[PDB]
Ligand SMILES: Nc1nc2c(ncn2[C@@H]2O[C@@H]3COP(=O)(O)O[C@H]4[C@@H](O)[C@H](n5cnc6c(=O)[nH]c(N)nc65)O[C@@H]4COP(=O)(O)O[C@H]3[C@H]2O)c(=O)[nH]1
Ligand SMILES: Nc1nc2c(ncn2[C@@H]2O[C@@H]3COP(=O)(O)O[C@H]4[C@@H](O)[C@H](n5cnc6c(=O)[nH]c(N)nc65)O[C@@H]4COP(=O)(O)O[C@H]3[C@H]2O)c(=O)[nH]1
Ligand SMILES: Nc1nc2c(ncn2[C@@H]2O[C@@H]3COP(=O)(O)O[C@H]4[C@@H](O)[C@H](n5cnc6c(=O)[nH]c(N)nc65)O[C@@H]4COP(=O)(O)O[C@H]3[C@H]2O)c(=O)[nH]1
Ligand SMILES: Nc1nc2c(ncn2[C@@H]2O[C@@H]3COP(=O)(O)O[C@H]4[C@@H](O)[C@H](n5cnc6c(=O)[nH]c(N)nc65)O[C@@H]4COP(=O)(O)O[C@H]3[C@H]2O)c(=O)[nH]1
């Protein structure tokens with residue numbers, strides 16, 4: 001399935017790993033020191049590299065760093081092999097560029113869970129690299145907005161262990177936007193909304209987290225959704241089961257902050273690369289989920305996502321907010337200047353909008369001239385403030401119209417609203433936002449107006 | 455992962471199957487008789503149906519037939535459960551519409567191999583049905599050529615057991631185009647060519663068939679190729695392994711003609727559904743393997759396939775033939791009549807070409823006006839005859855030009871060639887055919903001319 005380069009200074013650890021891997025029909029090469037590994041990686045371009053941190057002369061951290069310095073090998077996932085008490089090693093491993101970790105003595109189930117995961121990721125890395133090897137001509141100048149970190153990202157934690165769920169949220173909260181669900185039926189709804197990753201407790205007390213995963217896998221809206229399962233390290237059949245059922249990778253308890261950070265980045269990056277490929281690239285009807293001109297989301301895609309979000313909010317829990325933006329006198333711009341100038345303005349606006357709103361929000365080409373931002377887990381009072389932030393960035397700087405040679409002042413009107421309890425509807429939320437835009441032009445344009453229920 | 459409906463009259467066989475399936479986190483419903491099963495299938499629309507052939511009043515064959523009479527349930531894969539000596543059952547099962555089979559007493563590994571396979575197929579069945587639920591508007595009027603049977607199709611048999619390989623080829627030769635390789639290294643090359651399915655002996659003597667399968671899975675050209683493995687049923691570890699490495703489904707030895715025919719249909723049909731979905735649908739550069747106007751293959755796509763075909767032919771074994779077609783006075787048609795009339799001519803010709811040549815051949819839009827057909831396993835003497843067949847169908851009938859309101863005579867000139875020996879190349883092959891087309895015009899067009907290596 002893949003070509004693996006194993007690196008360790010002890011010729012015995014290398015043979016044991018080599019034997020285990022080729023018994024599962026991987027193609028394995030070896031290196032007993034750093035310089036050898038770097039030369040072989042550049043020559044062979046392996047799919048992944050298993051790298052021991054402890055080596056005399058040049059250690060694994062140095063090798064890992066050097067693999068990222070070389071533009072030829074940068075793209076190859078590196079797994080570091082650490083000792084039992086490997087906190088220091090994992091922290092240093094992260095800053096030296098490692099993709100994930102494995103602990104000695106090596107657990108076979110972890111070993112293969114890890115290789116399969118990064119192998120799957122390597123497929124999409126290679127595919128994306130092929131695309132980029134075509135442009136030069138317009139390096140997709142026909143598209144913009146395009147986030148490909150593993151960072152930001154809405155992470156749904158499905159766990160009835162309050163204490164642990166809350167710790168996992170706090171760990172992921174610096175680099176991500178976590179959300180907790182303890183009811184599995186409520187989680188099913190959230191999960192069909194804009195979620196980048198699900199983390200499920202496979203050892204929960206009140207629901208079967210594997211039965212929940214299988215459910216995600218049997219419905220269109222959640223079938224491609226990445227899933228990490230938290231598992232008890234003493235229950236081996238259960239770990240095997242989870243991987244057979246389509247869990248992407250597993251996190252042993254107690255949950256290690258550095259392992260957590262790493263597996264999460266992996267899965268979110270895999271998803272984003274995958275999505276980026278699905279889109280871009282050419283055109284189509286009902287298929288289609290982005291706007292060609294701006295590179296924002298469709299209305300089609302947005303209403304799908306907004307359906308789940310509002311449904312979740314009506315069963316208690318956090319509200320959703322909606323912004324309806326209209327560019328002031330936009331039709332008058334299409335007349336007195338060209339439609340080509342009009343495109344330039346639409347693209348520039350889309351860029352500033354998406355820049356100043358979270359990756360987990362949903363900025364959309366709602367219509368020809370109107371834009372919408374759906375914001376999960378956001379109250380009206382916060383959404384007003386966000387709208388003012390967007391309003392300032394567009395009004396605070398002139399747009400570059402005629403292919404570099406002219407400046408153009410632009411302002412927007414924004415209407416704002418948030419969900420409100422058991423009766424509320426997507427239709428009703430956007431109607432309130434629509435009233436808000438209408439009143440913002442009644443006050444004299446270039447303003448923000450909130451509309452609440454009731 | 456999926457919703458399964460199990461049907462059998464003995465409330466105990468049903469409970470045992472139900473228990474096994476829900477233990478793997480499938481969603482299982484049951485029916486104890488025919489009328490119940492039909493009502494439940496229509497109401498629930500399960501992903502697959504497991505159906506016992508023996509029931510009083512209304513047997514499984516009748517149920518199966520009735521499931522295919524209903525336009526609501528037609529699309530659902532049905533697996534028939536037969537007795538030990540089930541030849542009569544399997545033959546009747548095929549003519550009543552079954553997708554595959556399982557033998558009592560039920561083997562758990564077969565059971566799940568069969569469910570996972572048809573589940574994966576059901577994903578693509580549902581995807582295709584969603585597309586078709588959009589048109590009415592132009593039911594892809596912008597696409598023509600589209601084979602979606604499980605029939606025809608080039609099947610590569612990778613096996614060093616002469617007698618068994620040759621017997622499988624005979625069973626497949628009625629409905630398919632089989633090819634035998636006994637050398638795995640030669641088969642690796644063959645498999646990168648235009649192949650719809652590989653069948654590998656997992657119990658071979660001179661090579662490891664699982665190592666061969668693994669190698670297919672680790673290269674872009676062969677990664678997506680359906681594989682069936684022939685297995686000794688007494689060796690369980692080996693069957694399980696094959697499934698882990700990526701074998702799509704397995705075939706018990708000695709090989710049963712009806713089981714063989716069924717799994718082969720599944721795999722080839724799944725592949726074609728998938729390929730049709732990747733194409734059609736919108737547009738793109740280097741990505742894109744079909745011509746938009748005609749729906750034939752790209753030149754890019756063709757040259758890829760041709761390379762593997764010629765590489766294989768230079769290492770011994772059967773030759774490859776190439777037709778180069780040139781529509782006579784085509785630029786003159788573009789002048790006196792419109793480019794819209796030319797498009798209509800290019801579509802008609804494409805349709806007639808594709809219809810009168812095998813599905814395992816590669817008809818292509820080679821340039822703006824010129825066309826190429828590559829033919830695997832075809833000697834020069836046969837290519838000449840095939841070129842004449844095409845030439846007749848195009849000149850034997852007038853084309854319909856102006857949206858039905860004007861008819862038009864059209865002829866073609868064809869150059870024909872075939873590989874020869876160790877030295878040969880794609881470059882040389884096409885060059886030789888190109889001289890054929892040159893000479894065919896020098897005779898006065900509407901002709902065929904072959905060019906032999908030397
Ligand atoms: N969906 C969404 N919600 C938004 C957005 N902007 C603000 N909010 C919501 O409003 C709350 C208060 O935002 P803040 O006043 O800027 O106060 C913020 C801000 O000072 C800081 N902060 C958090 N994330 C970022 C960031 O990405 N960039 C910057 N510059 N500051 C941040 O942390 C504070 C608290 O953050 P939170 O706990 O998340 O609580 C946030 C969040 O729930 C947005 O673009 N999208
Ligand atoms: N005032 C305010 N502005 C907000 C807030 N949330 C988002 N923004 C604005 O939206 C930009 C993009 O947010 P992002 O997509 O989440 O992408 C963000 C996010 O992934 C991450 N980030 C930065 N600060 C924080 C933080 O405090 N908490 C978290 N979880 N992530 C952060 O870095 C990226 C870049 O951050 P920025 O340069 O600040 O650029 C931020 C910021 O200008 C907020 O709560 N308050
Ligand atoms: N079937 C059909 N319907 C048509 C056609 N042309 C316009 N419409 C419909 O008429 C509405 C108003 O068109 P508009 O006067 O150009 O007013 C437009 C235009 O001013 C602007 N706009 C839309 N697309 C673009 C664009 O790609 N570039 C620029 N610069 N402006 C655009 O936004 C406004 C709203 O556009 P829409 O939301 O699409 O709403 C459009 C659309 O639903 C057509 O050829 N066929
Ligand atoms: N790749 C390719 N090769 C072609 C094509 N047409 C003919 N050949 C090759 O030429 C041989 C003789 O063809 P035949 O004279 O029509 O004699 C044929 C024909 O009478 C019959 N036959 C086979 N397949 C078909 C079919 O799909 N339709 C029809 N009508 N007859 C067929 O069986 C005979 C032997 O078939 P083969 O053993 O395959 O041997 C075939 C095949 O190797 C083509 O479109 N594509």
Ligand SMILES: Nc1nc2c(ncn2[C@@H]2O[C@@H]3COP(=O)(O)O[C@H]4[C@@H](O)[C@H](n5cnc6c(=O)[nH]c(N)nc65)O[C@@H]4COP(=O)(O)O[C@H]3[C@H]2O)c(=O)[nH]1
Nearest residue numbers: 605606607626627628629630631808809810811812813814
């Ligand atoms: N004279 C001649 N013509 C050939 C040959 N091979 C292909 N063709 C022509 O190409 C058409 C399509 O072939 P196909 O795609 O393989 O699609 C074929 C093929 O899948 C299958 N088929 C028919 N006869 C045979 C056969 O004798 N052997 C096999 N393996 N398949 C057959 O039925 C489909 C329809 O067959 P047709 O209606 O005849 O329509 C055939 C036939 O007109 C050949 O060897 N000789």
Ligand SMILES: [Mg+2]
Nearest residue numbers: 009052054055
């Ligand atoms: Mg060491």
Ligand SMILES: [Mg+2]
Nearest residue numbers: 463506508509
């Ligand atoms: Mg029975």
Ligand SMILES: [Zn+2]
Nearest residue numbers: 451452453454
């Ligand atoms: Zn009111």
